[PDB]
């Protein structure tokens, strides 16, 4: 089709596909939710298949899965690692400990949610959120990344 609008819709569709297909997950491995993802990395529910690499250093990391309670001593760090991730970056909060305080909500040493520390994109629920459940959450991030229309907004801005 012929319209500067159509070219700018198709090209983000391209840019969005690249970010969607290759999300490298940075996993703050707090508490036990990290295990329920080590199961996602494992053979029954491979994540690599979906382009999500097993582990990438913070500097190389498109997503941050915060698994486990964010205590008031690890908070100052999470923010640092979130702040040092490359710009295109997304956060997935896994576990009722991270999205909200979960058991340990009323503790004096637990931040009641990582949303207080880092902006959160998808909240995956469950005490050990099941591994498919994380995989559904990562797939929901991919649906959110498809919908984003950054080039369209710059054109009509």
């Amino acid at each position: 089709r012929s319209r500067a609008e159509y070219v700018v819709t198709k090209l983000d569709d391209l840019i969005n596909w690249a970010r969607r297909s290759s999300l490298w997950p940075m996993t703050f491995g707090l508490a036990c939710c990290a295990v329920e993802m080590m199961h996602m990395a494992a053979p029954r529910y491979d994540m690599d298949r979906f382009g999500v690499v097993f582990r990438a250093s913070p500097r190389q990391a498109d997503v941050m899965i915060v698994a486990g309670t964010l205590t008031n001593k690890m908070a100052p760090a999470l923010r640092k690692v979130y702040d040092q991730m490359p710009e295109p970056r997304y956060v997935v909060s896994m576990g009722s400990c991270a999205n909200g305080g979960g058991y340990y909500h009323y503790s004096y040493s637990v931040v009641r949610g990582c949303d207080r520390i880092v902006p959160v994109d998808i909240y995956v629920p469950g005490c050990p959120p099941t591994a498919e459940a994380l995989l559904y959450g990562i797939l929901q991030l991919q649906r959110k990344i498809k919908r984003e229309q950054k080039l369209k907004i710059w054109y009509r801005r």
Binding site: N72, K73, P76, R79, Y106, S107, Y108, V111, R116, I117
Partner: protein, 198 residues
């Protein structure tokens, strides 16, 4: 109803007397629970002496320190009840030596007797505030670096007084007095009816 062998309640009882006799300067009470567990109670000054005798006595070798803890009975003048649980791999028995320490009356440290205590003693200071003299490096272990207050004290609020959030204006994490969105519902659970003479 659990099976109970009185062989142990007799063996352990006797040992209790043996310890007491050998260390009468410090042993105040020595009891065996109905659960076959001995619990020599010692004056705080007997921390070093009573442990050492148990770590290095042929008839009572208690080589490893299972745990060092401090219950806090606020009513009790001496608030804390430091409890040391020890194991004897030689005689397959455990004993507990428990002392009493108030907030500003420190206890001696046993890092000398058992180096296992190097960490647990730091844990007791951080949570309850008891101080241990002659400790190699006493410093908060579990609480945050700037935490004010000793958390496991019965007089410390569960939620605490400070919580953390990221503030954009200052682009840095920042404490604020705790503001909770659903306070801990304090269900009263005690029933007005007792169960037995005990």
């Amino acid at each position: 109803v659990r099976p109970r062998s009185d062989v142990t309640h007799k063996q352990l009882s006797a040992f209790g007397e043996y310890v007491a006799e050998i260390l009468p300067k410090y042993v105040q009470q020595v009891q065996v629970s109905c659960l076959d567990e001995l619990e020599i109670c010692i004056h705080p000054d007997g921390v070093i002496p009573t442990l050492t005798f148990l770590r290095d006595h042929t008839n009572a070798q208690f080589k490893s320190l299972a745990d060092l803890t401090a219950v806090d009975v606020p009513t009790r003048q001496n608030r804390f009840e430091i409890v040391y649980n020890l194991l004897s791999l030689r005689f397959n028995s455990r004993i507990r030596v428990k002392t009493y320490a108030d907030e500003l009356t420190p206890i001696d440290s046993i890092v000398s007797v058992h180096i296992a205590a190097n960490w647990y003693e730091r844990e007791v200071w951080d949570m309850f505030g008891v101080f241990f003299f002659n400790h190699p490096d006493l410093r908060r272990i579990l609480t945050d670096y700037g935490f004010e207050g000793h958390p496991f004290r019965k007089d410390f609020p569960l939620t605490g007084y400070v919580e953390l959030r990221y503030d954009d204006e200052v682009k840095r994490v920042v404490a604020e007095p705790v503001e909770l969105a659903q306070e801990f519902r304090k269900f009263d659970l005690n029933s007005p009816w007792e169960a037995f003479p005990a």
